[PDB]
From a paper:
Ribonucleotide reductase (RNR), an essential enzyme in all organisms, catalyzes the reduction of ribonucleotides into deoxyribonucleotide precursors for replication and repair of DNA. In the class Ia RNRs two homodimeric subunits work together to reduce diphosphate forms of all four canonical ribonucleotides (NDPs) to their deoxyribonucleotide counterparts. The larger α subunit contains the active site and two allosteric regulatory sites. For class Ia RNRs, dATP binding to the cone domain at the N-terminus of α2 has an inhibitory effect, whereas ATP binding reverses this inhibition.
We obtained a near-atomic resolution structure of the human α subunit of RNR in the presence of 0.05 mM dATP, 3 mM ATP and substrate CDP. Based on the lack of enzymatic activity under these conditions, this first near-atomic resolution structure of human α6 is in a dATP-inhibited state. Thus, each α subunit contained one CDP in the active site, one dATP in the specificity site and one dATP in the activity site. Six α subunits, organized as three dimeric units, make contacts through their cone domains to assemble an α6 ring that resembles the overall arrangement seen previously in lower resolution crystal structures of dATP-inhibited human and yeast α. The largest change is rotation of the cone domain by 20°, which is necessary for the three α dimers to interact with the requisite geometry to assemble a closed α6 ring. Density consistent with Mg2+-dATP is observed within the cone domain close to the subunit interface, where the nucleotide effector makes similar contacts to those reported in crystal structures of human α2 and E. coli α4β4. The equivalent residue in human α, Asp57, was not observed in the human α2 crystal structure with dATP bound, but density corresponding to it is apparent in the EM map and modeling of the Asp57 side chain shows that its position would allow it to hydrogen-bond with dATP. In the human α6 ring structure, the α2-α2 inter-subunit contacts are primarily composed of a hydrophobic core with Phe15 and Ile44 positioned on the two-fold symmetry axes and the side chains of Met1, Ala37, Thr40, Met41, and Leu47 contributing additional contacts. The conformation of loop 2 observed between the base of the dATP specificity effector and the base of the CDP substrate indicates that communication of CDP binding preference from the specificity effector-binding site is conserved with E. coli α2. We find that β2 access is impaired by the 60-Å constriction at the surface of the α6 ring and by the disordered C-terminal tails of α that extend into the ring.
Residue numbers in the entry:
A (entry chain B), B (entry chain A): -1 to 743
Amino acid sequence: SHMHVIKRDGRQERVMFDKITSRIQKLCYGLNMDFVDPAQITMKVIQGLYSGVTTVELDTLAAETAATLTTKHPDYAILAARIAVSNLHKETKKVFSDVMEDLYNYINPHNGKHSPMVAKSTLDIVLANKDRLNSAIIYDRDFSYNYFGFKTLERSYLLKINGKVAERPQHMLMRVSVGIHKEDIDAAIETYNLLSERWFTHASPTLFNAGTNRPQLSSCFLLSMKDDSIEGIYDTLKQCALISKSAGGIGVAVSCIRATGSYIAGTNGNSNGLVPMLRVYNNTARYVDQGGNKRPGAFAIYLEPWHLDIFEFLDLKKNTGKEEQRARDLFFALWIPDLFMKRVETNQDWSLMCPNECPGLDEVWGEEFEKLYASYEKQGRVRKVVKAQQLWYAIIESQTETGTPYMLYKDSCNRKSNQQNLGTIKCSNLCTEIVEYTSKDEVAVCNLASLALNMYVTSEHTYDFKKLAEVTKVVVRNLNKIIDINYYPVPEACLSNKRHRPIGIGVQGLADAFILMRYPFESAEAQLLNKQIFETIYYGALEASCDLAKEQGPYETYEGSPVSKGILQYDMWNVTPTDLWDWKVLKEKIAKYGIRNSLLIAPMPTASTAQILGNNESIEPYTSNIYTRRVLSGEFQIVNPHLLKDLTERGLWHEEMKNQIIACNGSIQSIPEIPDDLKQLYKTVWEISQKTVLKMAAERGAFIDQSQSLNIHIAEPNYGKLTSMHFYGWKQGLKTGMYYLRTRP
Amino acid sequence: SHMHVIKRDGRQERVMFDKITSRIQKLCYGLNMDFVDPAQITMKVIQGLYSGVTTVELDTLAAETAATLTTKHPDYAILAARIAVSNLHKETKKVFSDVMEDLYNYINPHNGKHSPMVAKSTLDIVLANKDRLNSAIIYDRDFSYNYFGFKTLERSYLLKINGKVAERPQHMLMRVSVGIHKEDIDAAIETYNLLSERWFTHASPTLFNAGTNRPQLSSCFLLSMKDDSIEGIYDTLKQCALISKSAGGIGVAVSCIRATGSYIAGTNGNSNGLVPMLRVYNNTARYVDQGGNKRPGAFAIYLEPWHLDIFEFLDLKKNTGKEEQRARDLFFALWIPDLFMKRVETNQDWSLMCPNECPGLDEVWGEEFEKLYASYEKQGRVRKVVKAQQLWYAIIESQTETGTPYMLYKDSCNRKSNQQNLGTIKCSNLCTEIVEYTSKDEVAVCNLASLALNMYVTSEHTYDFKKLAEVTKVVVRNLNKIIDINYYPVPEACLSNKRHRPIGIGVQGLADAFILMRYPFESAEAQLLNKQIFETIYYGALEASCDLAKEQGPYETYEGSPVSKGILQYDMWNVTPTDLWDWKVLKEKIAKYGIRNSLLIAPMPTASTAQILGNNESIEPYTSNIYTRRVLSGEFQIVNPHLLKDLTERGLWHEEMKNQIIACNGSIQSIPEIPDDLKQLYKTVWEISQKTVLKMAAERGAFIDQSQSLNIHIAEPNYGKLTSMHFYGWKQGLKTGMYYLRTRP
Ligand SMILES: Nc1ncnc2c1ncn2[C@H]1C[C@H](O)[C@@H](COP(=O)(O)OP(=O)(O)OP(=O)(O)O)O1
Ligand SMILES: Nc1ncnc2c1ncn2[C@H]1C[C@H](O)[C@@H](COP(=O)(O)OP(=O)(O)OP(=O)(O)O)O1
Ligand SMILES: Nc1ncnc2c1ncn2[C@H]1C[C@H](O)[C@@H](COP(=O)(O)OP(=O)(O)OP(=O)(O)O)O1
Ligand SMILES: Nc1ncnc2c1ncn2[C@H]1C[C@H](O)[C@@H](COP(=O)(O)OP(=O)(O)OP(=O)(O)O)O1
Ligand SMILES: Nc1ccn([C@@H]2O[C@H](COP(=O)(O)OP(=O)(O)O)[C@@H](O)[C@H]2O)c(=O)n1
Ligand SMILES: Nc1ccn([C@@H]2O[C@H](COP(=O)(O)OP(=O)(O)O)[C@@H](O)[C@H]2O)c(=O)n1
Ligand SMILES: [Mg+2]
Ligand SMILES: [Mg+2]
Ligand SMILES: [Mg+2]
Ligand SMILES: [Mg+2]
């Protein structure tokens, strides 16, 4: 008949338009009514309406229209967040316990199987404790997310039932706290309130599988080859298949595979090298997706540069060429020793050999690698001799073209790690921050936890240090409770992760801490500031693991580590820390009790986590002050809201200032309406000299017991800033030369 | 200095040209000197000579030039064979024993490893018995190969040392007879003389690895999936990797993998189907090569047509489209039941379902499959309904475009096999002749042995039957000795191949037996003839396995088979055999002693084996009377030498008759110089109606206890001859509808 809409109860009515403005103005309380205008939003919604429309599409399109209108006044972000979050909170259930009973009592709607979303012990903990725990949840905190962080949180992370999302966000975060803190409830309420107050957040597989039926909370996996045979290659392929099933990240050390042309004693033939093998890993990276297709399964391939197939390895992730000689859905990385640095330095030659001819090489680092490599370089057992600057030119061609390979430094990582007593660290994970020991028997597993920073900044614009160590103590107790609950997908993972027991802590949003502390990025108080911050994080981490080892005893391989010898991570950098803390009593209690976890700190990139909480990616500056937004039918420009927060107060903001920053791509310094302080507080990273950031990485990574991601931003391809940049990173002592060479077009 | 050639001792001399004609005329004894001309060969050799040439290149180019001059007179084939074979027999050693000591005493020339070419027990058998066995070898038989068969035999099959071939052909065939007949010598000399007199030959992995260090003599491997999980898929991928390492042929039953969109209870997602999985098997088929790169590892993928992904499965081996939706280095095949035949027959509908929804389907054949498929077709549990002639049109589009898929008939194979007591035969091998039971526990392995035919034709033009059964007895004793010596690459292979113990016998060159018996291909004595031949082969095979079971007892699962119930293979076809033999006493001795091997006869294609011995491919007619030859710088036309043998006697051959058959592509029937008998004795297969060949396949395959290859030759794409051809093959009862749709351009 007429234009009827399908009202959410399931019924239909006539189109009465004042229900829209009746609802929006109800959801506009507490905003600037001088620019909050329900009529424009209603008008663009009615531009899209038709007959027979479910009303949840009208609320979705209402929040979408408010998100597109956010450019006119910044309160429409708060409005659009209230529209989407109110749309969800009207939909699903109020009580957490009946949601959990609905998830456990799930039935596959065409197979009849009692196929739960949560394990029965999780439901046991909930139903035994629902009275305190339903009282602990606070739904006032769900209106605190950004809109785009809420849509990113909704599209993939909330547990769905037949396509309809059936979890509020506090149901997910309380589900995580039950999923980790099993027996105890006080830790679940301190962990819940410290969690939902957005102080720290766990990693994404923890948000996937906390308390579910297959609890695989880990996110870091480091695998090396079992053998240089078909059985080793395909058994390693099997382990990468299972681990990439249970939503992990896999970095593979592929150093020990014989090269093209070496003799095969079994079938009297010659090998074809690494290129079809890594092509098999290419199709495996396409087939298995992490979890329920939530993100594609990605593999890192690490190769040391002395291997003979290095040129076809570097020409492998490209765009042109034959298709059968490209494997472009992987991530390639070079695990470079100091000798290739020295031979590129003085234009000498370089010996590409085959690890069947020269066996047992990648397990040897430093001066011993110099002696063994020189002794094989003497005997003439090598196969090819290439001038080192030619291969360096090939590396800069590959990084210039695609950004791959990554570059890590072998002797720097093997020298400055707490797992020296085990052997030689072969590889690292996909995002190049977990530097741990791998073997044929031990497959390295590490857990993650990302602390935010800008929630700690007080109103005095003086940073809070004493809170940060305290939350770090709660985090270390969380991860150390994670390691003993996790279900490892392969049997080699449990022995490594329970013998050595590592954790991982990484912060996100350093640029917001600098803006809210009101310092320039290349100032003196910034370089003092991050140094003091990671002294606080590192100190509180060591105090927390000390207080755990006082209660459960240290890990199984402690005596032999340099921490048992008193050398902490900063002395391996030979940098005495500041007088901000008391390190003597810390080293006394460590010398009397040990520590519980081997490796502690690890700055991860946190793309998706910082996408949720609105912070910037972990430590880098803003890419531009204008950042785009992916909206259906609108992909548009939103300025940095801290910059806009200062501009509305300083008066220089007007109705075309956005258009004034369109034609400069974030560069606010070219405009004549300038207080000449925003040019220091809001430096575009393209307008930031990279070597100051590298010095800041030398200080901060000098207070980190693992590596850290390092997105290199360079506007134009030039070999001097690249070559001097990598050599400068090697001279400062960094464990990671690069993670991406990013060139803006 | 001057033009010096490097004489084979390693020295150098001046170019003296009468050494060439001094040698060729020495190697021309016994030929037609009216057309044997050393001066033309010498002239074209000296066209290629230069300074500093090793003289073995001069003999190689001499045999090559004689091979190109063979068109002028057929004795230059005998000449070129004598040149190449004399070139090899001047080179390597005369004594077999010192060759074997050289192979076992091999050392890798840059690793020092005593890496043998033969096992130490083989050398023990040789050195304990070298006195009789060096006397048994006859080097007069090496001048009996064709030239192109000798070059094909030399480039890949003779065991090389550092690129230089160090085996005479009788060294290889005697190496095979030592490699099979281990303790006994009389069987090695009867097997050697019956072998090197070119009566029968083993399969190609037997020629690869007889008596070597990794004895993997088998050539047929049938694998099904362990599980519909990641562990089953990648464990099956591991087994296909090891088996394709040790030079086997792998056919995989991929029926039991869930389709696109089905729910995954582990990670709450949906599967992507079969297309990326078979893309992973595509790169695995590219990476692992069979043996020492001797032929590329190929996989067969069998799918039953009721699976939901059947359309993307059929559009998968093509040329155009996106690259990520194609897997073209595989071989695809449909395992069709009778219901798709009946629904295509009467234009009805067809139910594409998912084997997670409808479990346990491919293990059910015939009327029970009709009942179970109708019961799932009733409940509405199916997912798609497609008109059957549409999918049949897609099949004819795929076979028309590339020739894949193959077509096998499920109920026909499950009904007419001796392994009915085990369960349901899921799949078959790559070349579609081995129809055996596969399981999660039993991986099917079958050995092969190809008998030639035209060596049996006596001078009376009456075929020898009593010899053929006798050589068949020697063959069955050979293969039954092969099964107990073989080293299976996976542990599931040994249990199947020792419980059920199958063998495989296939003949090659039926067209030569018809020409040497002087009958037309579509005559009456041809259809009588092959029927009598396979009654002889089948009878002698059953008598041989009976006489083995009289001595060792039948296999472990005999009682339950229809042979124990007295029904042989011909009664499953309901065709009483001829009165050529005595079947009553055979069935009495089988009824009193059983048989040793379950399945016996299997016509394989034998591309490479018939390429060696000069026979035609197994049972098909000649593709054309003119067949080309691959020669370096000359790829030219040589007529069928039996046709030429009749033409030089009947006088109609002249110096331009080749040019008269150029413009007709083998069709000798269009020329006016015709005795009108060669038009019957030498029918081009494009000039042969296919349904007579299908009737001949109904008779011959009615006397075969497994399937047989069937190369379908049709000159133009037409749907009536295709559709009526497959339906005609289903009406005759054949186990294999097609193996290739070949269209000449
Ligand atoms: N009769 C209507 N015609 C057109 N749009 C409507 C109508 N009623 C509501 N809408 C719009 C207003 C909102 O933008 C959106 C959702 O309305 P909403 O009131 O929340 O559904 P609902 O009526 O079931 O919720 P509730 O019953 O709790 O009020 O649909
Ligand atoms: N058929 C093959 N095709 C391509 N590569 C192969 C093949 N077989 C082996 N390889 C590669 C895989 C490994 O990188 C390497 C050695 O495999 P492996 O099984 O250890 O050889 P092997 O043990 O039979 O001889 P070796 O003793 O020299 O290692 O050669
Ligand atoms: N001096 C020569 N100059 C050019 N070609 C030669 C010369 N001698 C021989 N040839 C050709 C003739 C043959 O086609 C080919 C091989 O000759 P061949 O006699 O078999 O080498 P060889 O002399 O070492 O063998 P052998 O010592 O047993 O006689 O080279
Ligand atoms: N991450 C993935 N990406 C793509 N396909 C997958 C993935 N995980 C599983 N599959 C496919 C492979 C199999 O065809 C199918 C079932 O695998 P399987 O391990 O049995 O699932 P599961 O056991 O965890 O859940 P279920 O009990 O329903 O099988 O799903
Ligand atoms: N595309 C990606 C990126 C990271 N990761 C894994 O997640 C870890 C940290 O990356 P991250 O914190 O940015 O991942 P998110 O938590 O943001 O999803 C890495 O060590 C990888 O193991 C992944 O599996 N897939
Ligand atoms: N390209 C091929 C052809 C056949 N084969 C295997 O060899 C068996 C018989 O084929 P064939 O007799 O033509 O092989 P050859 O002996 O001629 O080399 C088949 O069952 C396959 O298992 C193979 O592995 N690769
Ligand atoms: Mg309403
Ligand atoms: Mg080996
Ligand atoms: Mg000579
Ligand atoms: Mg499963």
